[PDB]
Amino acid sequence: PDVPKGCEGPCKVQSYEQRHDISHVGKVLCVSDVTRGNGLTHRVGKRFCVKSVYVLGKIWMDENIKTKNHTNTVMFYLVRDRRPFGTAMDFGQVFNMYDNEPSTATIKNDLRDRYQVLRKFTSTVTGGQYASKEQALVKKFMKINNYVVYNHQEAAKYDNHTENALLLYMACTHASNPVYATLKIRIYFYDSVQN
Amino acid sequence: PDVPKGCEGPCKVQSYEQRHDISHVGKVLCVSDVTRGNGLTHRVGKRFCVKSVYVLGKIWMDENIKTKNHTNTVMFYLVRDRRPFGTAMDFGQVFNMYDNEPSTATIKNDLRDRYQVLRKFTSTVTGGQYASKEQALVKKFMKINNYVVYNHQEAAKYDNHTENALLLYMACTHASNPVYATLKIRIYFYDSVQN
Amino acid sequence: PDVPKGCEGPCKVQSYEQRHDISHVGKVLCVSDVTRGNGLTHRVGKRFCVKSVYVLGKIWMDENIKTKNHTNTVMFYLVRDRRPFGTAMDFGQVFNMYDNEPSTATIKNDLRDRYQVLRKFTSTVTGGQYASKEQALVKKFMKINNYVVYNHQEAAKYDNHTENALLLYMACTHASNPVYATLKIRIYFYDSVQN
Amino acid sequence: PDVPKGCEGPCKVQSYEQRHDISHVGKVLCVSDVTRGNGLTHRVGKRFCVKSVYVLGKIWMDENIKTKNHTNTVMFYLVRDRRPFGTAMDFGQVFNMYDNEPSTATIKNDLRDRYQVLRKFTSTVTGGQYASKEQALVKKFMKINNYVVYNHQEAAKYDNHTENALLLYMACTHASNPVYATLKIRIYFYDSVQN
Amino acid sequence: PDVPKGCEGPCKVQSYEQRHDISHVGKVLCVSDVTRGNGLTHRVGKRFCVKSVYVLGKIWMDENIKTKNHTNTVMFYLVRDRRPFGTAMDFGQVFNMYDNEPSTATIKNDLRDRYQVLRKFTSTVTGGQYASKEQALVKKFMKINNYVVYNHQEAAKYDNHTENALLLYMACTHASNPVYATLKIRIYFYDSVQN
Amino acid sequence: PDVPKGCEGPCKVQSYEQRHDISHVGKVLCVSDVTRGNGLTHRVGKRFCVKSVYVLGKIWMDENIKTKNHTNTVMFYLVRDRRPFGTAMDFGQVFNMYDNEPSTATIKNDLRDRYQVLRKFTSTVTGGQYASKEQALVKKFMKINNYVVYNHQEAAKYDNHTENALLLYMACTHASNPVYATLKIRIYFYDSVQN
DNA sequence: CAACCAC
DNA sequence: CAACCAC
DNA sequence: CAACCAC
DNA sequence: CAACCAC
DNA sequence: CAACCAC
DNA sequence: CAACCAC
DNA sequence: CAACCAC
DNA sequence: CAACCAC
DNA sequence: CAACCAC
């Protein structure tokens, strides 16, 4: 039961260790960016299956910001988009929402067929002068059998793939002040035998 | 399994993206206000079936209000009236309650046959000078097999209704200060074949 | 047996009566174009199923061209793109081939996933000073259950298409002279019930 | 068992409330006149099935006429005509009869294949100086599963349909003086899925 | 096995030996014409069943025409109209087509219900100065159980026809020159027992 | 059903888009040539299975050649040699034949064991001053499970081949003039698991 | 069978 | 269980 | 699962 | 489900 | 069906 | 399948 | 099979 | 039952 | 059903 259908070989990892600075406008990153090559943690051919994503790390408030009394959450929309073209679209223009508000957000009407939300998961942080909740921990494993397809070329970029691009979209709920998110996004995949 | 009884065609959506300023008196809006027309997100006949309501968004406090130390829950009441007539009745004259208190709110004895509460749900928010819970995220998917009927005229209003009509009543529990609720109310409906 | 799966209603028709002047470079047209409306020969919803395409007409030479001793054939590639964006792509840039020769034509290696060749069918014409053959008849019915989607907006254009979309690509085999093609491309479809 | 075969959707009504002034020569009206459009009580496509006709109202004598001692009946021939062309033919020239007499009337020999009588129903009124029967009531429901076909255009006119036109033919039995008939003819129909 | 349903008697024949000079505009003839009478090759009743049509003969060029380097084909559309009225309609006004091109010909959208194409069968001829092909043979048997009706009167004319009626429509593909067609159109029928 | 026995992975493609100028002597090319590498369209191991060959393109005359009254045909012998050594052998020395006539061609008696003719398929062209036929289309798909081996080294050459190896041999039937052949020879293979 | 229309 | 690693 | 959209 | 009311 | 790519 | 030779 | 006519 | 509306 | 005509 370990390896999925249409794909074979050892379960290959790929990590995206990064400190993401989050805003109200919303940040994006492509989680299914795999370079091609003979090396370990590379894809072999143009086709592979991402079995599971493991998001883990911490969301936290800056030292000058944490004094100010407020609350903010981040949403973590893991969305698959079929038909990925050019640059990855911004959070604001993919998601329909009232007054640029991430809590009210759903996929736009025109491109609802294109993009689908696989997971969303709120993580909340509260500021305070005398008593803050500076940080909150993220530990979300998620099994999502997602088959992707690349071009003839290889550079682990959003442009280079042409099917089921997996995108992580983040957005801070509070409008004024930002928050940081130190995250390891770890994607687990297998190389496809099909085609 | 997808389409309800006596219904046809694609699952049409209708959205009510809005910032509602809530009070102790209570605010109302009809969630079934949909126009008749050939286009998408329009009804075709006078009858149609609402399958599910997806309320999602945020409830939040203003900057001058959040300093003042208090708590308030917003009560969301989803009611169906079997009989609409004229404009929609205010929260005070539908629900009976001690001293206009929405936590004690149930339907009046006279019009208990008329109005029925399908779902109710709360959302707490706490203000504070040095440490606050400024906001709370409302997310609520509610499935209800509700058949609604309209007049011959087609303008998407509570006046044009007949038989059932889905009303959302929102009320702040605290007396003096108000709160905002930035909400997307999304109704999912199908066009009817019956009569 | 008549209507396909997930679609309903009367078999609606659409036609493209037009004289297409062909070159070696390659002409294109989108056969799945159909505007939205309450009237006949219009899609109701954004989704619809094309069940069958009926190409019929004539491919013919001009009076000054036919006198010259040569032969030319037209290929007629009916292709479906699962990802339409903006303007319909040119023949030369979709099909890779030696020296832009349409008889040596297959889909490019990059976008082999996007474009699929549903049908090809040649039609041949021979021009000579005395021993001539001015014209040739085309009569090709071809059945394909093909579910195309549109944007929210209503206009018969390849821009507005989404998910599946049909494209007829025509290209003359001989380099240094053209041929005309008077063709009724007819298309038979049904309105979708799904989503 | 409600909706007939080959047709679907809500049962749509169409009414013809009118005061028909009847003569010996005979009056006609097309009962299956349905305009096409998105609106309520419109047809959707060119094809629909009339399930049932409900004729109701009153036949009555004028104030100066009712003094004169006589009797007259009206026949109410509900006839389907296949092959409707141009204007609707007059009662006198469709029906063969002795000396322009409606009581002796049957369909003409040439166009017996074209026209068929679905219903006839006599309604009788008697005049008198000192004691009249001024009026008589009509209440005739009639179930007649009749599939009709329209042109590409739409205006709810006899010319605009090309199959199974339903015509009501009235004719006063007494030669000299006329009678009035205030009638609601109400036709019940469903939109066709076939073709 | 021989005689069709609802008809009886000896298989009566009828023939139309005639040189039909063809154009680009389109020539027509009614093959179901047969006068009423006690003699042979006459219908007895107003109804009769045409069981089969046997078209045979030659399609040929003139001596001055054949010298010119060109090609032309004739279409031979055998159609049944279920509603005959007056004179037989012209080819151009029944079949819609781009620039009156008979190879791009199908029945008009308005009267698609009235006219049905039972058979089409092309016949091709190539004219040249030396490398010529003056003529081409036509030999097409085609079986169709077809119940036609007449008026009360007795004359082999399309005027007098009613219910089904057969029409052969002929049209030359090339525009600027004619072709001759010496054709025996033969038709085999039986007298109806029904009605 | 898709992948052959003893081989695995995605169906890798290889192409040979080239204008082959043909003579009476006989041109050759090795269609099984494929270099070793981690990239796409490369064999991984020394062994691999060619499942199918798709020849498509055009065979055509030059402008000065076509005017002369003659005919020529090309044979297209697809042969497998089970013993490749060095450079690919010439057409004349493999096939024995009277006066180097390629239509009278079969494998020599000495090396009948080595070479086997898998497919032959003619393509004919006729040149004339006025009554010409400049070109002819080739479209030949042909499926053969064919396990080829290589040397230790990595280069797409017949030298490096071992065990089975494919060779396309082309030869013009007419002696005193050439013909061009613009051909995409495409080949579909899978990497071997055995040994 | 022809090409959404009919026996 | 934790997260391609192992009992 | 998240929310009429796809796998 | 929310609470004697309806679907 | 066309030609490793898809319903 | 091509044409006594092979998978 | 040819084309209402026959073995 | 009355007439596309509902028990 | 209304009356040789059609569904």
Side-chain angles (χ1 to χ4, degrees):
Chain A
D2 187 79
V3 70
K5 280 191 162 59
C7 47
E8 199 58 32
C11 184
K12 296 181 186 177
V13 312
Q14 174 61 32
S15 297
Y16 307 91
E17 295 177 45
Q18 194 175 356
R19 182 166 72 99
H20 306 284
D21 59 324
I22 312 302
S23 185
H24 193 71
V25 175
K27 194 176 188 303
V28 197
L29 71 151
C30 182
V31 294
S32 67
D33 276 341
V34 182
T35 181
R36 192 176 66 200
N38 57 344
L40 296 164
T41 76
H42 287 58
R43 66 197 159 86
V44 177
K46 78 190 95 184
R47 284 155 185 284
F48 64 92
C49 178
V50 170
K51 192 167 74 176
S52 53
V53 181
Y54 185 34
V55 177
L56 71 160
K58 170 164 75 87
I59 169 158
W60 58 285
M61 210 157 281
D62 196 7
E63 296 299 319
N64 67 323
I65 302 298
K66 67 178 280 184
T67 52
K68 297 166 185 175
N69 71 311
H70 64 276
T71 55
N72 41 23
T73 85
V74 299
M75 311 305 295
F76 293 122
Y77 298 108
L78 182 68
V79 308
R80 115 171 83 81
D81 82 280
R82 300 152 82 230
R83 321 196 268 276
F85 182 82
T87 55
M89 288 197 288
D90 184 29
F91 176 74
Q93 75 188 171
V94 171
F95 278 83
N96 191 17
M97 53 185 177
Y98 185 83
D99 192 38
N100 309 344
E101 180 55 53
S103 54
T104 62
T106 50
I107 302 293
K108 271 191 192 288
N109 194 56
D110 291 32
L111 42 82
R112 191 175 288 164
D113 187 27
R114 189 176 157 183
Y115 284 67
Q116 292 87 40
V117 182
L118 303 180
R119 292 292 200 285
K120 67 169 81 184
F121 53 101
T122 56
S123 289
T124 179
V125 190
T126 79
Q129 189 168 26
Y130 304 129
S132 180
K133 185 170 179 292
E134 182 189 51
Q135 70 208 20
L137 278 66
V138 181
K139 193 179 78 174
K140 196 74 172 180
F141 187 90
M142 35 180 71
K143 187 173 166 64
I144 46 142
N145 291 26
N146 182 260
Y147 295 81
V148 316
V149 184
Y150 269 79
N151 296 359
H152 76 117
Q153 73 182 308
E154 80 300 313
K157 297 203 292 91
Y158 179 75
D159 299 51
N160 291 184
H161 47 112
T162 185
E163 195 73 64
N164 295 1
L166 288 164
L167 301 176
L168 196 72
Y169 283 91
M170 293 163 290
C172 182
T173 314
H174 187 237
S176 187
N177 48 44
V179 292
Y180 297 125
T182 42
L183 293 172
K184 183 178 281 170
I185 314 304
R186 186 163 283 184
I187 199 167
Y188 298 109
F189 69 96
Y190 303 81
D191 301 304
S192 196
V193 179
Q194 294 173 314
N195 309 106
Chain B
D2 181 44
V3 70
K5 262 191 158 59
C7 286
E8 187 69 3
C11 182
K12 296 184 178 176
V13 315
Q14 172 62 24
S15 300
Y16 302 84
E17 294 173 48
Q18 196 175 322
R19 179 165 69 78
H20 307 290
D21 58 325
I22 312 303
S23 188
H24 192 77
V25 175
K27 192 177 185 300
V28 200
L29 78 160
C30 184
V31 305
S32 45
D33 290 342
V34 59
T35 175
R36 212 208 62 72
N38 64 330
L40 299 167
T41 75
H42 285 62
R43 68 192 160 79
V44 179
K46 69 180 75 176
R47 255 174 289 278
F48 70 89
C49 186
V50 174
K51 192 171 75 177
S52 47
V53 185
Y54 187 41
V55 178
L56 80 164
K58 162 165 74 73
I59 169 166
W60 64 293
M61 211 166 279
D62 209 331
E63 294 291 305
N64 63 327
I65 304 294
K66 68 180 281 185
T67 52
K68 297 165 187 175
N69 74 309
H70 69 281
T71 54
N72 56 346
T73 48
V74 161
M75 308 294 289
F76 296 91
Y77 288 104
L78 180 65
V79 294
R80 172 205 64 201
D81 65 317
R82 301 172 87 268
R83 305 189 267 287
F85 196 87
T87 54
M89 287 193 276
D90 197 52
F91 185 78
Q93 76 202 241
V94 176
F95 298 89
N96 76 311
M97 47 195 176
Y98 187 85
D99 198 60
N100 304 310
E101 177 51 50
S103 60
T104 60
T106 50
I107 304 298
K108 274 173 190 302
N109 193 64
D110 292 23
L111 42 68
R112 191 176 286 162
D113 175 43
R114 187 171 166 180
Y115 290 75
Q116 279 75 35
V117 182
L118 302 173
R119 292 288 203 287
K120 75 164 87 186
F121 56 98
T122 67
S123 291
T124 195
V125 194
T126 81
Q129 190 168 22
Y130 300 121
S132 182
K133 187 172 174 289
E134 188 204 316
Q135 71 206 16
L137 281 68
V138 183
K139 198 181 78 174
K140 196 78 177 179
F141 187 93
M142 305 173 291
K143 181 171 171 182
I144 49 169
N145 295 329
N146 185 240
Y147 307 94
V148 308
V149 192
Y150 270 73
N151 297 354
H152 87 299
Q153 73 176 319
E154 316 100 326
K157 293 197 281 76
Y158 184 74
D159 298 42
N160 303 141
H161 272 268
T162 180
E163 198 77 65
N164 298 309
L166 300 176
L167 295 168
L168 193 70
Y169 283 82
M170 302 178 289
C172 181
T173 306
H174 187 268
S176 182
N177 55 53
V179 279
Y180 299 130
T182 38
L183 285 160
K184 181 178 280 171
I185 316 308
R186 185 164 278 184
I187 199 175
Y188 298 120
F189 71 96
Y190 300 80
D191 300 315
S192 186
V193 185
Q194 294 170 315
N195 293 114
Chain C
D2 179 46
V3 71
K5 287 191 168 64
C7 43
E8 199 60 24
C11 184
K12 287 171 184 175
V13 312
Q14 178 70 11
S15 295
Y16 304 88
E17 295 175 44
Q18 180 170 10
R19 176 153 76 77
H20 307 295
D21 59 321
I22 312 301
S23 185
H24 191 73
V25 173
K27 193 174 185 301
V28 196
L29 74 158
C30 183
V31 304
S32 56
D33 287 336
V34 47
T35 191
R36 211 182 67 193
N38 62 330
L40 271 46
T41 76
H42 298 319
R43 70 203 164 76
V44 178
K46 64 174 71 176
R47 284 141 198 285
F48 67 91
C49 185
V50 171
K51 192 173 77 180
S52 51
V53 182
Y54 186 40
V55 178
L56 74 164
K58 170 163 74 71
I59 165 163
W60 61 296
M61 292 174 168
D62 208 326
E63 298 297 309
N64 66 320
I65 301 297
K66 66 182 284 189
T67 52
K68 295 159 186 175
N69 64 319
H70 63 84
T71 55
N72 41 35
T73 69
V74 170
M75 302 292 93
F76 294 107
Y77 297 103
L78 182 62
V79 297
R80 168 194 60 189
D81 63 296
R82 301 163 71 242
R83 307 193 263 283
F85 186 82
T87 53
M89 279 201 285
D90 193 14
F91 180 68
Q93 77 194 147
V94 172
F95 293 80
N96 79 306
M97 44 185 175
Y98 184 83
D99 198 56
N100 303 312
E101 174 51 49
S103 59
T104 76
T106 50
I107 305 302
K108 270 185 193 297
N109 197 59
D110 298 27
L111 42 67
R112 210 171 291 183
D113 182 35
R114 185 174 165 183
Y115 286 78
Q116 279 73 47
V117 180
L118 299 176
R119 290 293 209 287
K120 74 173 79 182
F121 59 102
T122 57
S123 291
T124 178
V125 195
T126 73
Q129 196 177 9
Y130 307 145
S132 187
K133 187 175 180 293
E134 184 186 316
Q135 74 207 0
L137 282 48
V138 183
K139 196 201 80 175
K140 195 73 174 178
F141 188 93
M142 37 176 76
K143 189 169 176 295
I144 42 164
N145 294 16
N146 183 55
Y147 299 86
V148 316
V149 185
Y150 261 80
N151 296 355
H152 78 126
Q153 73 198 327
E154 50 267 36
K157 288 199 280 73
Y158 181 85
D159 301 59
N160 301 10
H161 269 271
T162 183
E163 205 178 300
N164 298 326
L166 297 171
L167 293 169
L168 196 68
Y169 282 91
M170 300 173 288
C172 184
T173 290
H174 193 268
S176 195
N177 48 33
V179 288
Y180 300 136
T182 42
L183 290 162
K184 190 187 284 146
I185 311 304
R186 194 165 277 188
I187 183 181
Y188 300 112
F189 67 96
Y190 302 81
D191 301 323
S192 190
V193 179
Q194 300 182 247
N195 305 310
Chain D
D2 187 79
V3 70
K5 280 191 162 59
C7 47
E8 199 58 32
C11 184
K12 296 181 186 177
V13 312
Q14 174 61 32
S15 297
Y16 307 91
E17 295 177 45
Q18 194 175 356
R19 182 166 72 99
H20 306 284
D21 59 324
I22 312 302
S23 185
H24 193 71
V25 175
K27 194 176 188 303
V28 197
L29 71 151
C30 182
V31 294
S32 67
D33 276 341
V34 182
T35 181
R36 192 176 66 200
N38 57 344
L40 296 164
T41 76
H42 287 58
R43 66 197 159 86
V44 177
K46 78 190 95 184
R47 284 155 185 284
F48 64 92
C49 178
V50 170
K51 192 167 74 176
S52 53
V53 181
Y54 185 34
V55 177
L56 71 160
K58 170 164 75 87
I59 169 158
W60 58 285
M61 210 157 281
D62 196 7
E63 296 299 319
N64 67 323
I65 302 298
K66 67 178 280 184
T67 52
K68 297 166 185 175
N69 71 311
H70 64 276
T71 55
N72 41 23
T73 85
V74 299
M75 311 305 295
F76 293 122
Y77 298 108
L78 182 68
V79 308
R80 115 171 83 81
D81 82 280
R82 300 152 82 230
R83 321 196 268 276
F85 182 82
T87 55
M89 288 197 288
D90 184 29
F91 176 74
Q93 75 188 171
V94 171
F95 278 83
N96 191 17
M97 53 185 177
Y98 185 83
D99 192 38
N100 309 344
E101 180 55 53
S103 54
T104 62
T106 50
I107 302 293
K108 271 191 192 288
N109 194 56
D110 291 32
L111 42 82
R112 191 175 288 164
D113 187 27
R114 189 176 157 183
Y115 284 67
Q116 292 87 40
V117 182
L118 303 180
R119 292 292 200 285
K120 67 169 81 184
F121 53 101
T122 56
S123 289
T124 179
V125 190
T126 79
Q129 189 168 26
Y130 304 129
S132 180
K133 185 170 179 292
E134 182 189 51
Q135 70 208 20
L137 278 66
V138 181
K139 193 179 78 174
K140 196 74 172 180
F141 187 90
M142 35 180 71
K143 187 173 166 64
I144 46 142
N145 291 27
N146 182 260
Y147 295 81
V148 316
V149 184
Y150 269 79
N151 296 359
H152 76 117
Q153 73 182 308
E154 80 300 313
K157 297 203 292 91
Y158 179 75
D159 299 51
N160 291 184
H161 47 112
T162 185
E163 195 73 64
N164 295 1
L166 288 164
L167 301 176
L168 196 72
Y169 283 91
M170 293 163 290
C172 182
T173 314
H174 187 237
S176 187
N177 48 44
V179 292
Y180 297 125
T182 42
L183 293 172
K184 183 178 281 170
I185 314 304
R186 186 163 283 184
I187 199 167
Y188 298 109
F189 69 96
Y190 303 82
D191 301 304
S192 196
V193 179
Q194 294 173 314
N195 309 106
Chain E
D2 179 46
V3 71
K5 287 191 168 64
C7 43
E8 199 60 24
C11 184
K12 287 171 184 175
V13 312
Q14 178 70 11
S15 295
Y16 304 88
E17 295 175 44
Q18 180 170 10
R19 176 153 76 77
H20 307 295
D21 59 321
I22 312 301
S23 185
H24 191 73
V25 173
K27 193 174 185 301
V28 196
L29 74 158
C30 183
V31 304
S32 56
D33 287 336
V34 47
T35 191
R36 211 182 67 193
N38 62 330
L40 271 46
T41 76
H42 298 319
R43 70 203 164 76
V44 178
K46 64 174 71 176
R47 284 141 198 285
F48 67 91
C49 185
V50 171
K51 192 173 77 180
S52 51
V53 182
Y54 186 40
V55 178
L56 74 164
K58 170 163 74 71
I59 165 163
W60 61 296
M61 292 174 168
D62 208 326
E63 298 297 309
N64 66 320
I65 301 297
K66 66 182 284 189
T67 52
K68 295 159 186 175
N69 64 319
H70 63 84
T71 55
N72 41 35
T73 69
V74 170
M75 302 292 93
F76 294 107
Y77 297 103
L78 182 62
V79 297
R80 168 194 60 189
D81 63 296
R82 301 163 71 242
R83 307 193 263 283
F85 186 82
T87 53
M89 279 201 285
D90 193 14
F91 180 69
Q93 77 194 147
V94 172
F95 293 80
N96 79 306
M97 44 185 175
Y98 184 83
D99 198 56
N100 303 312
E101 174 51 49
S103 59
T104 76
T106 50
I107 305 302
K108 270 185 193 297
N109 197 59
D110 298 27
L111 42 67
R112 210 171 291 183
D113 182 35
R114 185 174 165 183
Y115 286 78
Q116 279 73 47
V117 180
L118 299 176
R119 290 293 209 287
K120 74 173 79 182
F121 59 102
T122 57
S123 291
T124 178
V125 195
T126 73
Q129 196 177 9
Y130 307 145
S132 187
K133 187 175 180 293
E134 184 186 316
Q135 74 207 0
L137 282 48
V138 183
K139 196 201 80 175
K140 195 73 174 178
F141 188 93
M142 37 176 76
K143 189 169 176 295
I144 42 164
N145 294 16
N146 183 55
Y147 299 86
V148 316
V149 185
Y150 261 80
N151 296 355
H152 78 126
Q153 73 198 327
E154 50 267 36
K157 288 199 280 73
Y158 181 85
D159 301 59
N160 301 10
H161 269 271
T162 183
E163 205 178 300
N164 298 326
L166 297 171
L167 293 169
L168 196 68
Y169 282 91
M170 300 173 288
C172 184
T173 290
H174 193 268
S176 195
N177 48 33
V179 288
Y180 300 136
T182 42
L183 290 162
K184 190 187 284 146
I185 311 304
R186 194 165 277 188
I187 183 181
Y188 300 112
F189 67 96
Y190 302 81
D191 301 323
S192 190
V193 179
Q194 300 182 247
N195 305 311
Chain F
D2 179 46
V3 71
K5 287 191 168 64
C7 43
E8 199 60 24
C11 184
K12 287 171 184 175
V13 312
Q14 178 70 11
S15 295
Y16 304 88
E17 295 175 44
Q18 180 170 10
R19 176 153 76 77
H20 307 295
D21 59 321
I22 312 301
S23 185
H24 191 73
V25 173
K27 193 174 185 301
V28 196
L29 74 158
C30 183
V31 304
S32 56
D33 287 336
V34 47
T35 191
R36 211 182 67 193
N38 62 330
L40 271 46
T41 76
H42 298 319
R43 70 203 164 76
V44 178
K46 64 174 71 176
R47 284 141 198 285
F48 67 91
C49 185
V50 171
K51 192 173 77 180
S52 51
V53 182
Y54 186 40
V55 178
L56 74 164
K58 170 163 74 71
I59 165 163
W60 61 296
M61 292 174 168
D62 208 326
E63 298 297 309
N64 66 320
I65 301 297
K66 66 182 284 189
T67 52
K68 295 159 186 175
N69 64 319
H70 63 84
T71 55
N72 41 35
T73 69
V74 170
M75 302 292 93
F76 295 107
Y77 297 103
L78 182 62
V79 297
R80 168 194 60 189
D81 63 296
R82 301 163 71 242
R83 307 193 263 283
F85 186 82
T87 53
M89 279 201 285
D90 193 14
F91 180 69
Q93 77 194 147
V94 172
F95 293 80
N96 79 306
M97 44 185 175
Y98 184 83
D99 198 56
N100 303 312
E101 174 51 49
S103 59
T104 76
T106 50
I107 305 302
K108 270 185 193 297
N109 197 59
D110 298 27
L111 42 67
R112 210 171 291 183
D113 182 35
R114 185 174 165 183
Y115 286 78
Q116 279 73 47
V117 180
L118 299 176
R119 290 293 209 287
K120 74 173 79 182
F121 59 102
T122 57
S123 291
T124 178
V125 195
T126 73
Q129 196 177 9
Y130 307 145
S132 187
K133 187 175 180 293
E134 184 186 316
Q135 74 207 0
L137 282 48
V138 183
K139 196 201 80 175
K140 195 73 174 178
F141 188 93
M142 37 176 76
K143 189 169 176 295
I144 42 164
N145 294 16
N146 183 55
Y147 299 86
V148 316
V149 185
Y150 261 80
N151 296 355
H152 78 126
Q153 73 198 327
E154 50 267 36
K157 288 199 280 73
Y158 181 85
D159 301 59
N160 301 10
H161 269 271
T162 183
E163 205 178 300
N164 298 326
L166 297 171
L167 293 169
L168 196 68
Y169 282 91
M170 300 173 288
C172 184
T173 290
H174 193 268
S176 195
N177 48 33
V179 288
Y180 300 136
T182 42
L183 290 162
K184 190 187 284 146
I185 311 304
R186 194 165 277 188
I187 183 181
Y188 300 112
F189 67 96
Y190 302 81
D191 301 323
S192 190
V193 179
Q194 300 182 247
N195 305 311

